[PDB]
């Protein structure tokens, strides 16, 4: 089959450059354009620029002259797609795309996995774990909401369970915010009955691998 | 030079709806946790293995992607495509995301968390917005200081599918220990399908 398959995800500090790779396999390599498009987490499809493995020639989109180069390795199958001077604007999932050379027409008819690049200026940082102290959701319906803020860590994953795995009805995690100062943050909320508040203990269990962190945190009720 | 369709079109399970891109014209879906599919090339090309329930129209700068008997499987992100000649250049629509309203309207709960006083005693204080258990996912979230409305410091979720299957977000407004204080009080307010809910926390008095 037609196979495009991509290198795995990269972190990098801004200013720096990376080199994303899309291996070809079950067609024959030099008779198809290869180009690249991106997506940014909050934004839509973003052209990159074409290549012609059949002699190496390039066309790139007007935003990224200057700071794209496209290359292929014919006895690999391989396209390459170096960025550099890189910004926080360029986190991004990059694609590879490949285009029938018949009729002129750019359009894509297969894609690569994509490859997550993440600018930011931090480094491996543990989250601090802070309580969401129980709060009334509903006092009708007799619920409150608690939590824990998982804040400024680096890189991606963090996990949260409840009570070691015993808590999952009405647990939900939300995905991670990169904030402006290039550090991760989540949440972790549960919904509870208020009368189980100050007879059920509630504790998030916090683990991030990249910085051996550790944290069993318990969310105790509020009071003067 | 520029593909222009509406972020947001809605329709229930069996109705007819329509995606509009203003400006050939080629539709590409994306379904999370795999590849954009092309559903129409070359304004109104359905290519083998595309179901037959999705079509394609251009009427002068207006194309159209419709999709007859919803599904609501269909709900996606959906991308309008064109080769500019003029530029050598690919562009893309701003992306259309297609949402099935396949269960009633239920509005968020809002709960919003004061800063801990471990983070406090770390000199730095974030407020955390918490909205449940509504339908459809979507909402606006805007925060205020007293009255006035805060520009900076607001980072807040794409809202993500809870396990009972309505959706939930979040919001935080980063701020500094002396303006948690300085202020009176501040807010989360949260608007959905019109509706507008808010929510207000101080600093706990003993
Ligand atoms: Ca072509």
């Known amino acids: 089959q037609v196979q495009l398959v991509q290198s795995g995800a990269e972190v990098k500090k801004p200013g720096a450059s990376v080199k994303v790779s899309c291996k070809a396999s079950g067609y024959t390599f030099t008779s198809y354009y290869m180009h690249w498009v991106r997506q940014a987490p909050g934004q839509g499809l973003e052209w990159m620029g074409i290549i012609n493995p059949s002699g190496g020639s390039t066309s790139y989109a007007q935003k990224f002259q200057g700071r794209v180069t496209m290359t292929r390795d014919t006895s690999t199958s391989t396209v390459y797609m170096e960025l550099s001077s890189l910004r926080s604007e360029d986190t991004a999932v990059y694609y590879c795309?490949?285009?029938?050379?018949?009729?002129?027409?750019?359009?894509?008819?297969?894609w690569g996995q994509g490859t997550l690049v993440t600018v930011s200026s931090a480094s491996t940082k543990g989250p601090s774990v802070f309580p969401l102290a129980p709060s009334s959701k509903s006092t009708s319906g007799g619920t409150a909401a608690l939590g824990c803020l998982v804040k400024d860590y680096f890189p991606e994953p963090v996990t949260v369970s409840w009570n070691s795995g015993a808590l999952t009805s009405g647990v939900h995690t939300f995905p991670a915010v990169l904030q402006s100062s290039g550090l991760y943050s989540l949440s972790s909320v549960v919904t509870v009955p208020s009368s189980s508040l100050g007879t059920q203990t509630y504790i998030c269990n916090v683990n991030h691998k990249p910085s051996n962190t550790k944290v069993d945190k318990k969310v105790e009720p509020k009071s003067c | 030079s520029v593909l222009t369709q509406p972020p947001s079109v809605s329709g229930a399970p069996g109705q007819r709806v329509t995606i509009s891109c203003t400006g050939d014209v080629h539709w590409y879906q994306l379904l999370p946790g795999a590849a954009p599919k092309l559903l129409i090339s070359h304004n109104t090309h359905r290519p083998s293995g595309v179901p037959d329930r999705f079509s394609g129209s251009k009427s002068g700068a207006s194309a159209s992607l419709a999709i007859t008997g919803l599904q609501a499987e269909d709900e996606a992100d959906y991308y309008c495509q064109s080769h500019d000649s003029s530029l050598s250049a690919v562009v893309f629509g701003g992306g259309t995301k297609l949402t099935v309203l396949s269960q009633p309207k239920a509005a968020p709960s809002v709960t919003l968390f004061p800063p801990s006083s471990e983070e406090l005693q770390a000199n730095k204080a974030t407020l955390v917005c918490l909205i449940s258990d509504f339908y459809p996912g979507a909402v606006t979230v805007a925060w205020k200081a007293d009255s006035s409305p805060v520009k900076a410091g607001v980072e807040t979720t794409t809202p993500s599918k809870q396990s009972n299957n309505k959706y939930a977000a979040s919001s935080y407004l980063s701020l500094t220990p002396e303006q948690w204080k300085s202020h009176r009080s501040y807010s989360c307010q949260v608007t959905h399908e019109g509706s507008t809910v808010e929510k207000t926390v101080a600093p706990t008095e003993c």
């Open positions: 795309a490949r285009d029938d050379p018949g009729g002129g027409e750019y359009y894509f008819d297969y």
